[PDB]
Amino acid sequence: EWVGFQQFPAATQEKLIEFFGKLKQKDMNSMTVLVLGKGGVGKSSTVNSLIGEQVVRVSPFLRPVMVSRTMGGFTINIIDTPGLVEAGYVNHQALELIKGFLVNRTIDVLLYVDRLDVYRVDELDKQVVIAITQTFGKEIWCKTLLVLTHAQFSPPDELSYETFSSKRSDELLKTIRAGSKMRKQEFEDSAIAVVYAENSGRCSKNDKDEKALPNGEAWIPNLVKAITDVATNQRKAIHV
Numbered sequence: 001e002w003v004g005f006q007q008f009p010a011a012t013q014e015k016l017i018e019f020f021g022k023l024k025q026k027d028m029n030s031m032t033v034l035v036l037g038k039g040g041v042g043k044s045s046t047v048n049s050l051i052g053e054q055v056v057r058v059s060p061f062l063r064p065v066m067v068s069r070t071m072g073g074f075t076i077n078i079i080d081t082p083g084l085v086e087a088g089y090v091n092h093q094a095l096e097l098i099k100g101f102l103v104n105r106t107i108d109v110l111l112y113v114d115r116l117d118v119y120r121v122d123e124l125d126k127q128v129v130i131a132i133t134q135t136f137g138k139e140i141w142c143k144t145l146l147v148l149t150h151a152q153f154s155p156p157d158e159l160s161y162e163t164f165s166s167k168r169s170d171e172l173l174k175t176i177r178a179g180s181k182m183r184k185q186e187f188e189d190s191a192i193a194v195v196y197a198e199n200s201g202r203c204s205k206n207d208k209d210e211k212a213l214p215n216g217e218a219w220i221p222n223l224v225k226a227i228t229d230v231a232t233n234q235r236k237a238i239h240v
């Protein structure tokens with residue numbers, strides 16, 4: 001059984017049950033979420049948050065792991081990956097160790113993880129988005145969510161949270177677009193959503209006990225809702 005689900009706030013559990021329900025009615029009774037990102041960005045910490053338990057390794061400084069948990073006839077399987085940067089360049093080994101582990105699997109969602117609290121995208125970020133396109137295909141971005149960790153960050157000086165985070169995520173979506181060399185046509189129709197994650201224990205709980213963003217909202221319920229939505233978005237899943 002899924003022990004982490006029993007830890008969640010009454011209100012998170014309730015919402016998750018509602019969301020797996022919408023999938024179950026379409027005959028989906030399992031889904032596989034791949035997690036990809038540059039090293040250091042909180043991929044493993046987002047997976048522990050989602051799973052509700054300490055399942056993958058978390059560190060400042062080989063080889064992909066999968067974590068399946070089941071609840072009420074539904075199975076979430078989430079693949080944590082080694083980071084894709086051996087700085088200051090793309091780590092092509094980690095990136096085909098990942099493909100090795102994915103052969104014969106169906107990936108329903110990609111959580112592309114980066115940090116909110118960063119002031120710029122660079123050429124390495126575009127190199128990473130091209131190394132992902134060269135490995136899984138253009139098609140993977142029709143199945144992607146941009147997850148931005150460190151969501152509780154307060155910018156200095158004093159552009160607002162909402163200026164900072166709209167520019168940050170605008171810059172990252174443009175880097176995905178350019179590195180992907182997707183055409184304007186497939187890109188709007190891909191409409192890749194941006195969900196926010198705060199994995200810190202210092203993280204504001206709202207008044208229903210759920211991990212909340214600055215705007216008030218339970219972020220794990222939003223993350224599972226946007227995942228459920230991409231799992232259901234009627235664009236086709238990725239095989240290999």
Ligand SMILES: Nc1nc2c(ncn2[C@@H]2O[C@H](COP(=O)(O)OP(=O)(O)NP(=O)(O)O)[C@@H](O)[C@H]2O)c(=O)[nH]1
Pocket residue numbers: 037038039040041042043044045046057058059060061081082083149150151197198199200
């Ligand atoms: N404030 C804050 N710290 C975070 C967040 N997510 C991760 N961290 C911190 O960032 C460090 C690296 O996190 P980790 O989960 O290992 O990221 P990763 O992408 O798995 N790294 P790698 O791929 O190299 O394994 C840890 O000290 C962890 O607590 C977040 O949302 N907020």
Ligand SMILES: [Mg+2]
Pocket residue numbers: 043044045057058059081082083
């Ligand atoms: Mg990790």
